[PDB]
């Protein structure tokens, strides 16, 4: 018997494990794609933030 | 249409007039590496035309009394052109070969050579002839350059290993009644799809006169042997400063 909405609205008893991931099959390591020359600006992947 | 043959590769161009044929090596053409095959990521360097061309090594001379020579391969071009250049600022390198040796004579000139080619062809040492020294053979005899080295006991070709079976890998036979060219087309041949030209040596190359030469003196006494060499299909990878040994 539920009535107000502090309680309809609720997340208390979200039993569900909320994951950010997703365990995929690697049977084999990765394999390489072939890459060229980039000469640009604005994309970095070399530098990170540890 | 046999006895002629035009080998252009490059800038360099051998022509034949008293040729046999082509020998290409346990019948397979020389190649680059797959992508199955390979697993270093890096991209190599594969020049086409300043590498893969004919090189001259030197010429020993044969006499009644010479009993064989072999030259280590890629020794021979390690201080030699741009593929040498290359080797030493490369830490890999993969490649086949196109053999070529002469030795002209006249029709009254007699005498046969075994050109073969032994992969892998470790160097025994007399073990100071007793048998009791475990002795090992220096730098000079191991890898030799393009000077070459003399065998001493060319029976067992310095190994162990007798001269009679080493037609069953690659040969031709120079008989100066039938031809003065022997051309042997060897693809690349390890366990590895690279390794180091400065550290390991994928084949020898031997060169033996099974019947000695003979002529009537009048004629002309110094008879040369010249080896005459191409990398096929080479392959770089791994870049830094370059070393010599």
């Known amino acids: 018997g539920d009535r107000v909405a502090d309680v309809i609205e609720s997340s208390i008893g979200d039993s569900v494990s909320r994951a950010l991931t997703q365990a995929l099959p690697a049977p084999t390591g990765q394999n390489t794609q072939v890459s060229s020359h980039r000469l640009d600006t604005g994309e970095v992947p070399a530098l990170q933030a540890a | ?153 060319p029976y067992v070709l310095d190994a162990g290993i007798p001269i009679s079976q080493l037609t069953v890998c690659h040969h031709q036979r120079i008989n100066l009644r039938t031809n003065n060219c022997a051309t042997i087309i060897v693809p690349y041949m390890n366990t590895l799809p690279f390794d180091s030209a400065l550290n390991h040596c994928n084949f020898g190359l031997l060169v033996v006169p099974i019947s000695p030469l003979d002529f009537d003196q009048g004629a002309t006494p110094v008879i040369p042997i010249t080896i005459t060499l191409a990398p096929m299909c080479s392959e770089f990878a791994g870049l830094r400063q370059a070393v010599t040994q």
């Open chain 2, 1 to 153: 249409s046999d006895r002629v043959a035009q080998l252009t590769i490059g800038n360099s161009t051998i022509t034949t007039q008293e040729a046999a044929n082509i020998i290409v090596g346990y019948g397979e053409w020389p190649s680059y590496c797959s992508d199955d095959d390979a697993t270093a990521v890096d991209k190599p360097t594969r020049p086409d035309v300043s590498v893969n061309r004919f090189y001259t090594l030197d010429t020993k001379l044969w006499e009644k009394s010479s009993k064989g020579w072999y030259w280590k391969f890629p020794d021979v071009l390690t201080e030699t052109g741009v593929f040498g250049q290359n080797a030493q600022f490369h830490y890999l390198y993969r490649s086949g070969f196109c053999i070529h040796v002469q030795c002209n004579a006249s029709k009254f000139h007699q005498g046969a050579l075994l050109v073969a080619i032994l992969p892998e062809y470790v160097i025994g040492t007399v073990a100071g002839g007793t048998g009791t020294e475990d002795s090992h053979p220096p730098y000079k005899q191991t890898q030799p350059g393009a000077d070459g080295f003399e065998l001493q006991h």
